[PDB]
């Protein structure tokens, strides 16, 4: 531009938000499972793990969460189940 410059910035903005029930960790067999790169959400009856910037729910598995200690120390621990996707191949 005459005696200057102009920048056109292209950026990304979240648009529509929904709002659920959340928990810090899951206790399965006396072990607390923490998410790897996501966050635990609940739609009312079931528990999923979602990426933090886009609602894309998925089934909790052993490949998706990492275990650390027992579930007596954390505050908002909750109760659920983890698939451990090796049973069908075992049979």
Partner 1 sequence: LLTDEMIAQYTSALLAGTITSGWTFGAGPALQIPFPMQMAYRFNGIGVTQNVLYENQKLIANQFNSAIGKIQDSLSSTPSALGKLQDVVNHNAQAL
Ligand X SMILES: *[C@@H]1O[C@H](CO)[C@@H](O[C@@H]2O[C@H](CO)[C@@H](O)[C@H](O)[C@H]2NC(C)=O)[C@H](O)[C@H]1NC(C)=O
Q: Which does 13 bind (CB under 5 to 8 A by kind): ligand NAG, partner 1, ligand X, none?
A: partner 1
* Contact positions with ligand NAG (CB under 6 A) in 62-81: none
Residue 19, interface with ligand NAG (CB under 6 A)? yes
Q: Which does 61 bind (CB under 5 to 8 A by kind): ligand NAG, partner 1, ligand X, none?
A: none
Q: Are the CB atoms for 51 and 35 separated by under 8 Å?
A: no
Strand 26-27 relative to strand 78-79: parallel, antiparallel, unpaired? parallel
Q: Are the CB atoms for 46 and 23 separated by under 8 Å?
A: no
Q: Which residues make up the interface to ligand X (CB under 6 A)?
A: 43-46, 79
């Amino acid at each position: 531009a005459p005696h200057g410059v102009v920048f056109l910035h292209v950026t990304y903005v979240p648009a529509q938000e929904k709002n659920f029930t959340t928990a810090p960790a899951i206790c399965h067999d006396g072990k607390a499972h923490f998410p790897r790169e996501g966050v635990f959400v609940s739609n009312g009856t079931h528990w999923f793990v979602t990426q933090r910037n886009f609602y894309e729910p998925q089934i909790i598995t052993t490949d998706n969460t990492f275990v650390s200690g027992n579930c007596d120390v954390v505050i908002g621990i909750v109760n659920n189940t983890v698939y451990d996707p090796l049973q069908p191949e075992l049979d």
